[PDB]
């Protein structure tokens, strides 16, 4: 299953990779604009088919809350993540993390979607809703994705 990352958002994925991997920066946690807020904003943008949009939002939340700590983190981010778990247990990841990591989710979710118990028509509907949400992210890219949400990791972090 091929999920299509909007062409406008790929330079931001490059920037995210640069900030985390080269410049050794970290996204501000807890996120000031968390994944829950973004999903709520999208659900409200759609209702301005309601049960369908809410199902997509719930599914994105579930997949993110399973995948954030497993597949959505650069290695340099692992300590911070552990820190978060220590500081705010029982807080779901959709409440702690923000837009860059939710975007990272769609780079890897397509591999998982091939094992969902849906037929061809429903899988096409799901891909439709997912690409709709992705272009919603692309429309609001100016407010959602920004290097100003990243900060230099302190020397304490590097050990």
């Amino acid at each position: 299953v091929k999920v299509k990352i909007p062409e406008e958002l790929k330079p931001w994925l490059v920037d995210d990779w640069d900030l985390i991997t080269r410049q050794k920066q970290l996204f501000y946690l807890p996120a000031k604009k968390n994944v829950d807020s973004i999903l709520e904003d999208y659900a409200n943008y759609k209702k301005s088919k309601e049960y369908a949009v809410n199902e997509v939002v719930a599914g994105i939340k579930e997949y993110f809350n399973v995948m954030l700590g497993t597949q959505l983190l650069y290695k340099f981010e692992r300590p911070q993540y552990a820190e978060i778990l220590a500081d705010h247990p029982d807080a779901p990841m959709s409440q702690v993390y923000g837009a860059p990591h939710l975007l990272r989710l769609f780079v890897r979710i397509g591999a998982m979607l091939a094992y969902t118990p849906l037929d061809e028509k429903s899988l096409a509907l799901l891909l439709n809703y997912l690409h709709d949400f992705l272009k919603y992210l692309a429309k609001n890219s100016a407010t959602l994705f920004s290097a100003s949400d990243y900060e230099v990791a302190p020397p304490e972090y590097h050990r």
């Binding site: 790929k10 490059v14 990779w17 599914g59 995948m67 497993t70 290695k75 998982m112 969902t116």
Partner: protein, 247 residues
């Protein structure tokens, strides 16, 4: 069930598998390119919906008169298909003379029936390119090539005076003495790359007395396919067995 159910059997295991995040190379290549050369600016130009005539007017001298095309009684099917005589002399029908009326599909350029699923993307060694987000069938009218219609004298003047700091080159030959120059003004067609094995082609049509160029699909293309045509000194990176080496 559900609209977005979780993955079953081996999908649960793969979803819960710990794997350090890796940016795919079809995105990460941009970073190395931005380090070797600069991050490309947003390509700016004056977007126009119709050609702009500078010092020439590309008149064709042909008034499109009626054909013998049959107007389908079923309003579902289009009128002027492959056997239209106007279409066969590469002239679009006129709305005042066509027997098929508003069912005629030989007015695609003048009705601006552009394909609306094109997208500008970054191609590794070719810069900006145009891809189609939906599938296209052969012979489909895709888009019109727009720009400033200039004489070869005007184009040479422009190349002497302001296209000396340019590494691309944005023009179609409308004639042996007229050119459609899309350096400054045009549409998305100015981003379509060259190929030695093209999937599209440019066709010159007589549309209500003036010549206009349109890009038509040479063969079927699935979604995500980059549009190319044969431009007719740059190293060619089209990547095709029996490539001419140079554009």
């Amino acid at each position: 069930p559900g609209l977005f159910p979780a993955p079953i059997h081996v999908g649960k295991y793969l979803r819960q598998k710990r794997i350090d995040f890796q940016l795919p190379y079809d995105i990460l290549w941009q970073w190395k390119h931005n380090q070797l050369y600069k991050k490309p600016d947003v390509p700016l130009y004056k977007k126009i919906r119709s050609n702009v005539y500078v010092d020439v007017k590309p008149l064709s001298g042909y008034e499109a008169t009626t054909c013998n095309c049959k107007k389908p009684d079923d309003d579902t099917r289009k009128g002027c298909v492959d056997d239209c005589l106007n279409r066969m002399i590469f002239a679009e029908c006129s709305p005042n003379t066509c027997p098929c009326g508003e069912q005629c599909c030989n007015q695609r350029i003048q009705r601006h029936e552009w394909v609306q699923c094109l997208e500008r993307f970054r191609a590794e060694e070719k810069g900006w390119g145009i891809r189609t987000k939906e599938p296209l069938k052969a012979g489909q009218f895709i888009i019109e090539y727009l720009g400033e219609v200039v004489s070869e004298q005007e184009f040479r003047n422009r190349m002497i005076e302001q296209y000396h700091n340019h590494s691309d080159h944005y023009c179609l030959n409308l004639d042996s003495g007229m050119v459609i120059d899309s350096y400054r003004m045009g549409n998305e067609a100015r981003f379509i790359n060259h190929s030695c094995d093209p999937n599209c082609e440019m066709q010159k049509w007589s549309v209500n007395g003036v010549y206009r160029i349109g890009l038509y699909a040479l063969k079927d293309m699935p979604a995500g396919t980059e549009l190319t045509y044969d431009y007719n000194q740059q190293l060619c990176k089209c990547g095709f067995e029996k490539c001419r080496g140079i554009i």
